Ferritin, middle subunit
Amino acid sequence: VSQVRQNYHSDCEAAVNRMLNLELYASYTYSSMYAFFDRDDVALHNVAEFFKEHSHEEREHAEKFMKYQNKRGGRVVLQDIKKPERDEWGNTLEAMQAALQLEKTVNQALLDLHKLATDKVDPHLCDFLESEYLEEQVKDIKRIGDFITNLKRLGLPENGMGEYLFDKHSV
Amino acid sequence: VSQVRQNYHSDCEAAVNRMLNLELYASYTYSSMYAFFDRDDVALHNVAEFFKEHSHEEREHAEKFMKYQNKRGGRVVLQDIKKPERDEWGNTLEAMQAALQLEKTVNQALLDLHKLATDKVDPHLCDFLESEYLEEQVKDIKRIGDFITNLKRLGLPENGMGEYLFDKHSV
Amino acid sequence: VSQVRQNYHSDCEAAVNRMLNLELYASYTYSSMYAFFDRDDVALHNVAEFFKEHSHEEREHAEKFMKYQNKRGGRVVLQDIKKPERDEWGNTLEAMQAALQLEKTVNQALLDLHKLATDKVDPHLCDFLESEYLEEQVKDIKRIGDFITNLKRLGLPENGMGEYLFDKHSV
Amino acid sequence: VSQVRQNYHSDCEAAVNRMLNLELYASYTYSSMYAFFDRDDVALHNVAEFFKEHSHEEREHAEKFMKYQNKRGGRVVLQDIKKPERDEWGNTLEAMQAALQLEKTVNQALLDLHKLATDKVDPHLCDFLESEYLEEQVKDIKRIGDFITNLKRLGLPENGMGEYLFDKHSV
Ligand SMILES: [Cl-]
Ligand SMILES: [Cl-]
Ligand SMILES: [Cl-]
Ligand SMILES: [Cl-]
Ligand SMILES: [Cl-]
Ligand SMILES: [Cl-]
Ligand SMILES: [Cl-]
Ligand SMILES: [Cl-]
Ligand SMILES: [Cl-]
Ligand SMILES: [Cl-]
Ligand SMILES: [Cl-]
Ligand SMILES: [Cl-]
Ligand SMILES: [Cl-]
Ligand SMILES: [Cl-]
Ligand SMILES: [Cl-]
Ligand SMILES: [Cl-]
Ligand SMILES: [Cl-]
Ligand SMILES: [Cl-]
Ligand SMILES: [Cl-]
Ligand SMILES: [Cl-]
Ligand SMILES: [Cl-]
Ligand SMILES: [Cl-]
Ligand SMILES: [Cl-]
Ligand SMILES: [Cl-]
Ligand SMILES: [Cl-]
Ligand SMILES: [Cl-]
Ligand SMILES: [Cl-]
Ligand SMILES: [Cl-]
Ligand SMILES: [Cl-]
Ligand SMILES: [Cl-]
Ligand SMILES: [Cl-]
Ligand SMILES: [Cl-]
Ligand SMILES: [Fe+2]
Ligand SMILES: [Fe+2]
Ligand SMILES: [Fe+2]
Ligand SMILES: [Fe+2]
Ligand SMILES: [Fe+2]
Ligand SMILES: [Fe+2]
Ligand SMILES: [Fe+2]
Ligand SMILES: [Fe+2]
Ligand SMILES: [Fe+2]
Ligand SMILES: [Fe+2]
Ligand SMILES: [Fe+2]
Ligand SMILES: [Fe+2]
Ligand SMILES: [Fe+2]
Ligand SMILES: [Fe+2]
Ligand SMILES: [Fe+2]
Ligand SMILES: [Fe+2]
Ligand SMILES: [Fe+2]
Ligand SMILES: [Fe+2]
Ligand SMILES: [Fe+2]
Ligand SMILES: [Fe+2]
Ligand SMILES: [Mg+2]
Ligand SMILES: [Mg+2]
Ligand SMILES: [Mg+2]
Ligand SMILES: [Mg+2]
Ligand SMILES: [Mg+2]
Ligand SMILES: [Mg+2]
Ligand SMILES: [Mg+2]
Ligand SMILES: [Mg+2]
Ligand SMILES: [Mg+2]
Ligand SMILES: [Mg+2]
Ligand SMILES: [Mg+2]
Ligand SMILES: [Mg+2]
Ligand SMILES: [Mg+2]
Ligand SMILES: [Mg+2]
Ligand SMILES: [Mg+2]
Ligand SMILES: [Mg+2]
Ligand SMILES: [Mg+2]
Ligand SMILES: [Mg+2]
Ligand SMILES: [Mg+2]
Ligand SMILES: [Mg+2]
Ligand SMILES: [Mg+2]
Ligand SMILES: [Mg+2]
C-alpha cells in the first residue's frame, strides 16, 4: 500500500486508469479530424485547427488524470490507444456530429466515475471531477451543438458555399 | 438561535469546533519541529523553515474555521491546545514520518466532517471542505511522502551526508 | 490521385504512416516514464519532467509527419498506439537505458525511411528527414548516452545518494 | 576554365541556365494573371495581388540561379522569355488550375536538375536545390491545390457569388 494512500478505493483507481485511456482515445480521434481537414481535397484550415486544438486539450486532460493517480497513491496503468473509428470524416457537419457524440461519451464516463466516487464516499475525487472536468465538458458539448445547428442552417452537407462560410466566420 | 443560521446542524457546529482545535494542534506540532531543527546540535535550517511555514499554514487553516463558524451563525468554542507528542524529533526522516501521520490524521478528520455534512445535507459545508481543505491536504501528503522516499534513498537515518544533501537541495 | 501529388511513391507514403505511429509510440513510452518518476515511492521530479518534455517533443514529431503526408498528397492512416513495453521502469539508469534503445529504434526507422526515399529518388523526403529529424535524433542519443555514463559513475542502481544527486544537478 | 570552378559539370551549368529561363517564364505567366484580374471586367483585386506577389517571387528565384551560376564559376547564358500560353485566364478557378500545372512543371524541372546533380556527384548543387527550392515548391503546390478545392466547393466557374467570396476571404 502506498504511504500516501487514504480513502482511495481500488475500483476508483482502476476507473481513473480507464478514464485516462478514454481521454487519450478522444485526443487521437481529434488528431484524425485535424489530418482530414488539412487534406488538399478537403482544405478547411480553420476547421482543421479547431480539431487540432481539441486534440491538445484532450491530451492535457489525460495528463491531469496521470498526475491525479499519483497524488492519491494509485498506480498509472496504460493500455493501447485504439485508432479512431473512421479514417475519413466526410465533411464539417459529419465531423462535428462525431465530435458531439465523442464528447457525450467522455461526459458519460466522467459522470459514471463521479457516481462511483460518490458510492465509495470519495469527496476528493468528486471535487476533482466537478472542478476540473464536468463544466468544461458541458461547455464543449454546447459549443459543438451550436456549430451543428449553424452547419445545418448553412445547408450542409450539400451546400459547399455554406461550408466555406462556416470555416471563414465561425472558427 | 442566530438570525443568520440556516441549515446548520448542531452536530456540524460542534464538529467544526473540534476541527479548529485539531488545526491548532497541528500548527503547534509543526512549531515544535521548527524549534528542534533550529537547535545548535541539529542545525538543519532549511528543514526548520519548512516546518515553520507549515506551522503558519495550519494556524491560517484554524482561523478560516473560526470565520466559517461565525458566517454560519455557529459559535466558536475553544479548548486547550495540547502540546506535541514529542519534545525532540530525532532527525529529518523521523520528523517527516511524524508529519505524514499528522497530515493523514488531519485529512481523516476533514473526511469525517465531510461525511457528517453529507449526512446532515449541508452542501455549503461540503463545498467549503472540498474547496478550501481537501485538495491542499492531498497535495501536502504527497509532498511529504515524496520527501520520505528521498530521505530513505539518501540513507537516513544513518547517512549524515544524505541528511545534509537533502537540507541543501530539497527544501 | 491527389492533385498535388508529384514524385511521391506509394511505398514512401505507407512508410511515413508507419513512422508516424512509431513517433506516437515513443511519446507514449516517455509519458509512462514521466508517470513512474512522479510516483510517491519513486519521487524524482526533475527526471519525471525530463521524460514529460520528451513525450511532448515526440508528439510534435508525429504531428509534423501528418502535416508532411498532406503536403505531399498522401493520406494519413492511423493505427493503434501500442502501450509501452513496461509498466514500471526500475530506476533512473534503467529508464535512461530504455530511452537510449527507444531513441536508437526511432533513429533506425528514420534511416530506413531515408534509404527508401533514396531508392525511390525522392529528394524532398530525404531533405525533410535530414533537416527535421536526423540531427535532433543524434543529439538526443548523445545526451542520453552522457546521462547513462554519469548514472553509472554515480553508482546506479545501488547508490541512492547518486540517484538523488543526478536528479538535483543533471536535469 | 574559371579559377573558382570545382566539381561543376558542363551539363549542370547548362541545366542551371535552362532552369533560370523557366523561372523567368513562370514569373511572366504570373504577371499576365495579375494583369487579367486587374481588368475592369474581371476586377478581383485580391486575386490579382496574389499573382503579382508570385510573379515577384519567381523573379527572385531566377536571380538566385544567376548568383548560383557565378558562385560555381559557370556562365549565365540568357534566352528569350516566352510569352505566357494564354492572353486571358477565364476566371479564378481556371487561373489557379493553370498555376498548379505551372508549379508542377517548375517542380519537375527542379527534380530533373536534382537527378542530374546526383548523377554528376554534385552535392553542393543538390543541397542548393533542397535548401532553397524544393520545399517552397511543395508548399506552393499545396496552397494552390487547397485553393482549387475551395473554388470548386464555392461552385466555380458558374457561381459568381462564390468567386466574390473567395476573393474576399481566402486571399
Ligand atoms: Cl485507501
Ligand atoms: Cl474516510
Ligand atoms: Cl487498471
Ligand atoms: Cl502537457
Ligand atoms: Cl486494449
Ligand atoms: Cl472511414
Ligand atoms: Cl471543469
Ligand atoms: Cl446562513
Ligand atoms: Cl439551522
Ligand atoms: Cl435545507
Ligand atoms: Cl463545541
Ligand atoms: Cl492569519
Ligand atoms: Cl482539553
Ligand atoms: Cl520526546
Ligand atoms: Cl483545498
Ligand atoms: Cl492522500
Ligand atoms: Cl506521384
Ligand atoms: Cl521525378
Ligand atoms: Cl499506410
Ligand atoms: Cl502540437
Ligand atoms: Cl496495431
Ligand atoms: Cl513492468
Ligand atoms: Cl534535425
Ligand atoms: Cl567552387
Ligand atoms: Cl569543374
Ligand atoms: Cl569531386
Ligand atoms: Cl546554356
Ligand atoms: Cl530582386
Ligand atoms: Cl528561345
Ligand atoms: Cl487566350
Ligand atoms: Cl525551399
Ligand atoms: Cl507536391
Ligand atoms: Fe474537447
Ligand atoms: Fe481543459
Ligand atoms: Fe476530455
Ligand atoms: Fe473533449
Ligand atoms: Fe474545451
Ligand atoms: Fe501542512
Ligand atoms: Fe492553505
Ligand atoms: Fe491544516
Ligand atoms: Fe497540514
Ligand atoms: Fe500546504
Ligand atoms: Fe526525444
Ligand atoms: Fe524537435
Ligand atoms: Fe521522435
Ligand atoms: Fe526521441
Ligand atoms: Fe530532443
Ligand atoms: Fe510561386
Ligand atoms: Fe522564395
Ligand atoms: Fe520558382
Ligand atoms: Fe512558383
Ligand atoms: Fe511561395
Ligand atoms: Mg486495485
Ligand atoms: Mg475505454
Ligand atoms: Mg482495432
Ligand atoms: Mg450524496
Ligand atoms: Mg458534492
Ligand atoms: Mg466544488
Ligand atoms: Mg468550476
Ligand atoms: Mg449545539
Ligand atoms: Mg481533537
Ligand atoms: Mg498532557
Ligand atoms: Mg479546488
Ligand atoms: Mg499506396
Ligand atoms: Mg511500427
Ligand atoms: Mg498488446
Ligand atoms: Mg545517392
Ligand atoms: Mg542528399
Ligand atoms: Mg540539407
Ligand atoms: Mg540541420
Ligand atoms: Mg559547358
Ligand atoms: Mg525551358
Ligand atoms: Mg511564340
Ligand atoms: Mg529547408
In short: The pocket of magnesium ion (ligand 54) is lined by residues A 18, 21-22 (CB under 6 Å). DSSP finds five helices and no strands in chain D. The CA atoms of residues 23 and 60 of chain D lie 9 Å apart.
